[PDB]
Amino acid sequence: GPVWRKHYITYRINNYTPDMNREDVDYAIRKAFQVWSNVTPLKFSKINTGMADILVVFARGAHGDDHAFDGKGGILAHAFGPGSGIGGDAHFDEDEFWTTHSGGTNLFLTAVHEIGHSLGLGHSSDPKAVMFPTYKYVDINTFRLSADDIRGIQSLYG
Ligand SMILES: O=C(CCCC[C@H]1CCSS1)NCCCS(=O)(=O)O
Ligand SMILES: [Ca+2]
Ligand SMILES: [Ca+2]
Ligand SMILES: [Ca+2]
Ligand SMILES: [Zn+2]
Numbered sequence: 001g002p003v004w005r006k007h008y009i010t011y012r013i014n015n016y017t018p019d020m021n022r023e024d025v026d027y028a029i030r031k032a033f034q035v036w037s038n039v040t041p042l043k044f045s046k047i048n049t050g051m052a053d054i055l056v057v058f059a060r061g062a063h064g065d066d067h068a069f070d071g072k073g074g075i076l077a078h079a080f081g082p083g084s085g086i087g088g089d090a091h092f093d094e095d096e097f098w099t100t101h102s103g104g105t106n107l108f109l110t111a112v113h114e115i116g117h118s119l120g121l122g123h124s125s126d127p128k129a130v131m132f133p134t135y136k137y138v139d140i141n142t143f144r145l146s147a148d149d150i151r152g153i154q155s156l157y158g
């Protein structure tokens with residue numbers, strides 16, 4: 001499938017969930033990109049205006065693509081693989097309650113998984129992988145990519 005053919009990738013946070021402090025949104029997303037830049041040649045920079053490669057949106061229900069959200073629960077987020085326009089973009093369901101910890105749905109973990117899609121990864125069958133389809137909280141300091149995630153991403157980049 002598609003991959004980014006350049007090393008400098010930009011992101012932009014389109015809007016912010018009212019679920020969290022702004023600074024904590026910024027931090028979660030930044031740390032989630034770092035997970036991936038740690039194991040690839042990629043570099044990620046946040047921009048505040050203009051077209052970014054990866055636009056980070058919080059939205060509910062029908063939100064302008066063919067991938068409507070479903071209210072609280074179920075689908076938490078989705079992202080598009082590498083490509084121009086909507087390609088790369090990561091969308092998070094505002095009907096979830098996003099958090100820094102275990103209380104609702106952890107933004108960091110979810111963002112790691114979505115950014116993996118944004119980079120070109122599909123789902124893993126390994127329950128230990130961040131690219132496994134099902135959300136399960138793990139302490140956000142205990143978190144590591146699985147071997148399977150690392151193989152997947154390095155098979156695409158690096
Ligand atoms: O695929 C996703 C992103 C969530 C990944 C969360 C990470 C937790 C640690 S590793 S995966 N959302 C839709 C399916 C979720 S749901 O069906 O389980 O409610
Ligand atoms: Ca894009
Ligand atoms: Ca949902
Ligand atoms: Ca919310
Ligand atoms: Zn969407």
Ligand SMILES: [Zn+2]
Binds near residue numbers: 113117123133
């Ligand atoms: Zn997924």
